[PDB]
């Protein structure tokens, strides 16, 4: 029971027993915590509890030291000292922000604001606390027992009475019973098992509650600026393709860590892989939270880097299908592509952490704990989507609060900014440039004259909470008959239920705005579905319309975002 105080590092035997992460708090900070919060249980080798037989006094403010033991006011000997007095709690070696992190339920946006504006040790305490609170919350839901199986992809479920039913989307991942992880989509439901197994009737599914490990490494290592490129050896023969990023690559070797804000289609993966060609002998670990982000880096590496020096790290508990072209699980290869949770304990000359808007402070800390590098490059865009905060229900989380990296990019600016969008028609570039980039994003492409908008509120029905707009899908159906080139469009909306309906009525491939992030398609058809904070979110709107290379049709519910679209308006 010997450790360091999370607020002032002073050594102690005192841990707060009421905090779910039981942080070590010194004599001074333990007092400031117990006297200002409902937290009154203090722990050491032995807890601070009344030693008198059958006594239930556990409140440190109602306890005293009687020689070497602890007793309440009713049981203490005449010669006894209060454990709580004079701004200290008794212990060996003898905060407003800590109290709020320690006691919040993580349902308000203000809780996440604090977890990102506090000191570095409090950011780790906040990240550990939040993740443990998120995992304990998973236990609240009800079990689903297979009543009947229809085909190889569809079944019917029987839910536990009394306990709430979690939202059925590709976001919530169940664990089958250990018949592999399973996922659900909208009385006939669609079942998706990782391991192809003949769905046994009577078997049950439960959400994967994993143990939250403690955080040691900071979210960001301390910044170091150098006079020369350090520990990296540049090429003088650098491919003309990557010449645009030479000054940025030099900035990377002249700092401990660097931030790159890359709006959609501005060249983030090109930048990440070109960094390997610019420092040809440097061992680079490419990491991101999702398998899709890691795979998109693998695809770019396949095109420019020697395949024999690449390796895709895959966890033995193979969840989803990923990149199969590199040698699997070779930690020692020069180029290692791996998701944040599967990272081995290794070193590198450069660590590239991509899709930084999707990282949490927990992820930022894990990377710093498993990878010791000469340089760290954080690539992403705070104008794109963050990681879903399952507990957050009240208030909106602004980009400067996504994580420490996004906070830096939004306050002091990013170290490097990719200012030219090469993917999108100018109509889209001009719209998002004004909306989220302060007019700094420029279009490479001309206006395509294939970007349309329609203001159509339709009718909003709901599949539990997930929304559907059948009249908006009807407008799309009518448009498709008159615009056959759009037969190849990807249908996008903010809701899985809208997408399930569009899939059956239109037959187009479907994507939620959130799962479309990082991907691009020639034609995109977007139905806003509703006017909610979710469907009107500017970052979500930004991602939605920037998926299109050639054309986009936006069927809008919100007048504000409709008016902001620099698209040709359609009638009906
Ligand atoms: Zn302290
Ligand atoms: Zn506490
Ligand atoms: Zn007592």
UniProtKB/Swiss-Prot annotation:
Residues the entry annotates as binding Zn(2+) 11: 5, 8, 26, 29
Ranges of the LRR repeats in the UniProt entry: 208-228
Binding, a ribonucleoside 5'-triphosphate: 262-269
Phenotypic consequence of residue 399 to S: In strain: Mu/B.1.621
Organism domain of life: Viruses
Places the protein is found: Host endoplasmic reticulum-Golgi intermediate compartment
Effect on the protein of changing residue 321 to D: In strain: Gamma/P.1
Domain CV ZBD: 1-105
Amino acids binding Zn(2+) 12: 16, 19, 33, 39
Domain (+)RNA virus helicase C-terminal: 419-572
Binding site for Zn(2+) 13: 50, 55, 72, 75
Catalytic activity: ATP + H2O = ADP + phosphate + H(+)
Every (+)RNA virus helicase ATP-binding domain range: 237-418
Subunit architecture: Interacts with nsp8 to form the replication-transcription complex (RTC): nsp12, nsp7, two subunits of nsp8, and up to two subunits of nsp13. Interacts with host TBK1; this interaction inhibits TBK1 phosphorylation and decreases by 75% IRF3 phosphorylation, which leads to reduced IFN-beta production.
Function recorded in the entry: Plays a role in viral RNA synthesis. Multi-functional protein with a zinc-binding domain in N-terminus displaying RNA and DNA duplex-unwinding activities with 5' to 3' polarity. Activity of helicase is dependent on magnesium. Binds to host TBK1 and inhibits TBK1 phosphorylation; the interaction with TBK1 decreases IRF3 phosphorylation, which leads to reduced IFN-beta production.
Name listed for the protein in its UniProt record: Helicase nsp13
Record gene name: rep
């Amino acid at each position: 029971a010997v450790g360091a105080c999370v607020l002032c590092n002073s050594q102690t035997s005192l841990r707060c027993g009421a905090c779910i992460r039981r942080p070590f708090l010194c004599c001074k900070c333990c007092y400031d915590h117990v006297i200002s919060t409902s937290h009154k249980l203090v722990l050491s080798v032995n807890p601070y509890v009344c030693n008198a037989p059958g006594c239930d006094v556990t409140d440190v403010t109602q306890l005293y030291l009687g020689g070497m033991s602890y007793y309440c006011k009713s049981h203490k000997p005449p010669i006894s000292f209060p454990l709580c007095a004079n701004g200290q709690v008794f212990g060996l070696y003898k905060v407003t922000d800590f109290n709020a992190i320690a006691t919040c339920d993580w349902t308000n946006a203000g809780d996440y604001i604090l977890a990102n504006t506090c000191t570095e040790r409090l950011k780790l305490f906040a990240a550990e606390t939040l993740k443990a609170t998120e995992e304990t919350f998973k236990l609240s839901y009800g079990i689903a027992t297979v009543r009947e199986v229809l085909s190889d992809r569809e079944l019917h479920l029987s839910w536990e009475v009394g306990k709430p039913r979690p939202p059925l989307n590709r976001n919530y991942v169940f664990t089958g019973y250990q018949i592999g992880e399973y996922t659900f989509e909208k009385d006939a439901v669609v079942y998706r098992g990782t391991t192809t197994y003949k769905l046994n009737v009577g078997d049950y599914f439960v959400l994967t509650s994993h143990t939250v490990m403690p955080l040691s490494a900071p979210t960001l290592v301390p910044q170091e600026h150098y006079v020369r490129i350090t520990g990296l050896y540049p090429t003088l023969n650098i491919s003309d393709e990557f010449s645009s990023n030479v000054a940025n690559y030099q900035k990377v070797g002249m700092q401990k860590y660097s931030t790159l804000q890359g709006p959609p289609g501005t060249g983030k993966s090109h930048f990440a892989i070109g960094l390997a060609l610019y420092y040809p002998s440097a061992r680079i670990v490419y990491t991101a939270c999702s398998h899709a982000a890691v795979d998109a880096l693998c695809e770019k590496a396949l095109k420019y880097l020697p395949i024999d020096k690449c390796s895709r790290i895959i966890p033995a508990r193979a969840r989803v299908e990923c990149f199969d072209k590199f040698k699997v699980n070779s930690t020692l290869e020069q180029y290692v592509f791996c998701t944040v949770n599967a990272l081995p304990e290794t070193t590198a000359d450069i660590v590239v952490f991509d899709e930084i808007s999707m990282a949490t402070n927990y992820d930022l800390s894990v990377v710093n704990a498993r990878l010791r590098a000469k340089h760290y490059v954080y690539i992403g865009d705070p104008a794109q989507l963050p990681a879903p905060r399952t507990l957050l229900t009240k208030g909106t989380l602004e980009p400067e609060y996504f994580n420490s990296v996004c906070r830096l990019m939004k306050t002091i600016g990013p170290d490097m900014f990719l200012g030219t969008c090469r993917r999108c028609p100018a109509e889209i570039v001009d719209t998002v440039s004004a909306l989220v980039y302060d007019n700094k994003l420029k279009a490479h492409k001309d206006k395509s004259a294939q970007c349309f908008k329609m203001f159509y509120k339709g009718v909003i029905t709901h599949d539990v909470s997930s929304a559907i707009n059948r009249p908006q899908i009807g407008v799309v159906r009518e448009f498709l008959t008159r615009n056959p080139a759009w037969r190849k469009a990807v249908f996008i909306s903010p809701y899985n239920s809208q997408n399930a309906v569009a899939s059956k009525i239109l037959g187009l491939p479907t994507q939620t705005v959130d799962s479309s992030q990082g991907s691009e398609y020639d034609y995109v058809i977007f139905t806003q579905t509703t006017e909610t904070a979710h469907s009107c979110n500017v970052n979500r709107f930004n991602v939605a319309i920037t998926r299109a290379k050639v054309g986009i049709l936006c069927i809008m519910s919100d007048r504000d975002l409709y008016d902001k679209l620099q698209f040709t308006s359609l009638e009906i």
